[PDB]
Structures are given as C-alpha cells and as structure tokens.
C-alpha cells in the first residue's frame, strides 16, 4: 500500500481558530499520530509528503505555471522517528496559496515514479486543508482520468465537518471530483481534522496471521 500526504501550508493554514486548532496545526498533529502508528507498525508502508502553498516550489517537475509553490517534503518511503521530527519540527506554514490540484498531479507523478516494482496493493493520496487555498479547475478531467488509471484512493480532511465561500466552492469541487471517482461513497472519504484526531489518537492494533 502507498499513502501520500498532499498538505496545504498556505497562510489559510496559519490562521488559528478560537475553538479548535488551526488547519495547519490539526494537519501536523494528525500526520504526527499517523506516522507514529506507522513507525511503531512493522507494516513497512511507504509514505510520501507533499506540501502545497509553500513559499517556494519543490517538485519532480515544477512546470511553467503549474506545480508552483508546492514542495515535496518527503518522497514515498517507510516512516521513521526522523520523519516524525520533520513533521513536528520542520513543517512550517507557507505564505503562498498554490493550486492543490497541481500538488495532486505532483502526487500522482510521485506515486507513478515510486510504485514501480512495488508490492503496493493500495495507493492513497490524503489531502489536509480548509479549501480556502486558491486552485484551478482546468486539470479536473486529466486528474480524474489519471487517478482512475493509477488507482490511487483519495481522502480529504478538513477543520470542519462535511466556512467561507472559497471553502464552500472547493468543498463542492472535491464533492464532484470524488463522486465521479467513486460515487456517493466518495462523500464518505471526506473527513474533518477533529474526527481524525479522535479516530487516530490510538495506535493501530497489532495483528498477524496463522
């Protein structure tokens, strides 16, 4: 299985909430707990980290205008305490508001580059944001097509349950994207940061086979 994290680090992440953590901090904490469970797991699942909205661009291809303000923090690889320190100590919010679809293409390219010769019965892309980051809807067709080709599951986690008008617009866009990809059950793959905090506050249970 392959899991990829397409993370917003834009200033909209930086904005804290009086009731809950900032989407940046919530994303950081969820990534931290997930990777803790992974490292303590012996599942040897490779994990990649993609950050969009970063001040600079860091991608296998940075395009001309696409793939900009997006940083591939970590490539698909097994987690470690080093990765956890990167999550907690090195993950800082960016100022740019990059297209999350460009980072999504970055992630599909990374998966296609790193799932080669790999026993990856699953491929996953998990995106944490509040959907107020800017984006372009022109790549929806090719993104959906290549996602159905490379067979990568998609998950969205938000600072809110299933918000500003940009967040609502992005919410409807991801709704239509995931309805196209997997039908109405795609709406079930969009989650909130608080629900992920509550669901992943515990490590995975160890299980083997006879």
């Amino acid at each position: 299985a392959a899991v990829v994290l397409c993370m917003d680090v834009g200033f909209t992440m930086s904005n804290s909430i009086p009731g809950i953590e900032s989407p940046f901090e919530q994303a950081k904490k969820v990534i931290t707990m997930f990777v803790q469970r992974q490292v303590f797991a012996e599942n040897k699942d490779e994990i990649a980290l993609v950050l969009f909205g970063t001040d600079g661009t860091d991608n296998p291809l940075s395009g001309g205008d696409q793939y900009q303000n997006i940083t591939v923090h970590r490539h698909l690889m097994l987690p470690d305490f080093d990765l956890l320190e990167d999550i907690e100590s090195k993950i800082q919010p960016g100022s740019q508001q990059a297209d999350f679809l460009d980072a999504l293409i970055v992630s599909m390219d990374v998966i296609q580059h790193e799932t080669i010769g790999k026993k990856f019965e699953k491929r996953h892309i998990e995106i944490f944001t509040d959907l107020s980051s800017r984006f372009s809807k022109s790549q929806l067709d090719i993104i959906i097509h290549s996602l159905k080709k490379c067979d990568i599951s998609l998950q969205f986690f938000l600072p809110f349950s299933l918000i500003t008008e940009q967040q609502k617009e992005g919410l409807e866009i991801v709704k239509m994207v995931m309805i196209s990809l997997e039908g109405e059950d795609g709406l079930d793959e969009i989650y909130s940061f608080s629900e992920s905090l509550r669901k992943l506050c515990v490590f995975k249970k160890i299980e083997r086979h006879s």
Binding site: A1, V3, V30, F34, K122, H124, I125, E126, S153, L154, Q155, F157, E189, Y191, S196, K199, L200
Partner: peptide
C-alpha cells in the same frame, strides 16, 4: 473502509 490515513 480503512484507506490511506485509516488503512
């Protein structure tokens, strides 16, 4: 079902 983060 458990996928990505939940898998």
């Amino acid at each position: 079902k458990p996928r990505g983060l939940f898998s």
